[model samples]
Each structure stands twice: as structure tokens, then as C-alpha cells.
Target: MQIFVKTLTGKTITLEVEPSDTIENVKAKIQDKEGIPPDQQRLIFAGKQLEDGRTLSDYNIQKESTLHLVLRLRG
Candidate 1:
């Protein structure tokens, strides 16, 4: 399955994911593709914050689900 990620600037990233994939895995993918670290990537799904150890299936995330990505400030 796949999901959509939206940035603060409205740019969208399409990610291919599996139901067993954890939020941490998704963060790493974002880091690889977007140059943002897992620590700096904040993902929101269905208005709830996603935890690193949780799986997409745990939250019932389906195909084409939209996730909001917010960047954390750091130096």
C-alpha cells in the first residue's frame, strides 16, 4: 500500500508502505528521501500523533492515507 505525506509548505511526498511497517520505518524513509532525520520528523495521522514503535496497522492506516508532516526546529 501507499500513503501521502504533506509538508508545512504544501509539498506532497508519496510513500510506499506496508501494513506491518512502523512509524519509525516511515520516518527513516522520509529522512532518506527528504533529508530530514527521524528526530526532526513529526507525523500526524488522522489528527493523532504517531509513535515510533507503532505499526500502521495498529492505527488502521489504509492505502492512500494522508499523513501530515511537521518539521521540528533544531540547530
Candidate 2:
């Protein structure tokens, strides 16, 4: 499935991931692409934090769906 991810910095990245992949996997991919850490990541879908270990299907994510991934940087 293809998912559209929008970063807090306004950068958008499109990824082709398996439907079985968990939200954590998505987080890792975003961190890998954005050069950030998972701990600093916050993924929101439908205005809620995607629960850990939850698959895209669990959240009712569809193909070409867009999810907001906000990075929380520490001072």
C-alpha cells in the first residue's frame, strides 16, 4: 500500500509499504528518511496518535492515505 506522510516541517514523503506493517514500521521509515529517531516521532491519523503495534488496516488506512507525522525535538 502507498501511504502519504506529511512531516511537521511541511515535507511530504510517499512510501510503499506492506499492509501488514505496523505503525512502528512506518515510524522507523519516516525516521530513516527524515534522519530522526523514533522516540522523537509522533504519528497522527484521523487526529489521534496511532497506537503502537497497530497495523494500517487496524486504523482503517487506505491506499494513498495521508498521515501526519510530527517530530518532537528536544531542546
Candidate 3:
């Protein structure tokens, strides 16, 4: 499956995943591509917060799932 991930710079990456991919795993991939830490990353899919420890399948995320990557900056 190819997941679409948008970066803060308005760039996008093709994230390869399966239905079993966890939200945490997606965050790990984002952290790798965007250089953001997992703890600071937030993933939004289907207008809902993609929480950690949950598989994409659990969220009904299918192929070509769109994910918004939000990096939380410490204040």
C-alpha cells in the first residue's frame, strides 16, 4: 500500500505500508523522512487523531490513505 504523507514544507512522501502497519510505525517513518521525533509527531487520518499502538486497519485505513503530519514544538 502507498500512503500519502504531507510534510510541513508542503512536500509529500510515498510511504509504503500494509494494513498491519501501526500508527507508531507510520510516525517512525515520518520521523525518518521529516526529521521529527516520534514524541513530537501527530498523525491525522480520516479527520481523527491516529493514536499510537493502533494498526491502520483498525482505523479503516486503506490503500492510498492520506495522513497529515503535525509536529508539536515544545514551548
Candidate 4:
């Protein structure tokens, strides 16, 4: 499944993935390309936080779904 990520600041990103992929998995992809550490990423969808232990499908993530992502301050 393909997913879109949109920052609250309005930046948009794209991803190609599977339903079994965890939110952490997507964060890793973002970290690899965008330089934001996985620990710093907060993936939100449909107004709830995406859990690292759950698969994308658990959140009903579908194509064109633009998950809102926030970055926490790195410590």
C-alpha cells in the first residue's frame, strides 16, 4: 500500500509500503531519507497516534491517506 505523509507545517512526503509494516518501519524510511531519527517521529493518523507495535492496516491505512507527522525535539 502507498501512503502519503503530511507535516503540520504542510510539507508532504510519500511512501510505498505494505499493511504489515509497522509505523516504526515507516519512521525508519523517513529517517533514512529525511535525517530525522526514528525516535523523533510521531506518526498520527485519523487523529490518533500510530503505534510502533501495530501494523499499518491496524490503523486502516490505505492509499492516498495522508498521515500527519510531527517531529519531537531531539534530546
TM-score winner among the candidates? 1
- State residue 72's C-alpha deviation in candidate 2, in Å: 1.9
Choose 3 or 4, whichever is better by TM-score: 4
lDDT-sorted candidate list, best first:
1, 4, 2, 3
* lDDT for each candidate structure: 0.95, 0.86, 0.86, 0.88
For 1-75, candidate 3 gives per-residue lDDT tens digits of 898987678878888889998999998887787677899988888679888999999999989878887778876
Q: TM-scores, in order shown?
A: 0.96, 0.88, 0.88, 0.92
Best by lDDT: 1
Off by over 4 Å in 4: none
Query: Pairs clashing in candidate 4?
Result: none
- Clash total of candidate 2: 0
lDDT of 2 by residue, 1-75 (tens): 799999777888998887788988988887778777788888898898987699998988889999998777686
**Residue 9 alpha-carbon offset, candidate 2, angstroms:** 2.8
- For residues 7-73, what per-residue lDDT tens digits would candidate 1 score against the true structure? 9999999999999999999999999899998999999998999999999999999999999999889
Of models 1 and 2, which has the larger lDDT?
1
Candidates ranked, most accurate by TM-score first:
1, 4, 2, 3
User: In candidate 2, which residue pairs get closer than 3 Å at backbone N, Cα or C atoms, i.e. clash?
Assistant: none
Q: What is residue 18's positional error in candidate 4, in angstroms?
A: 0.7
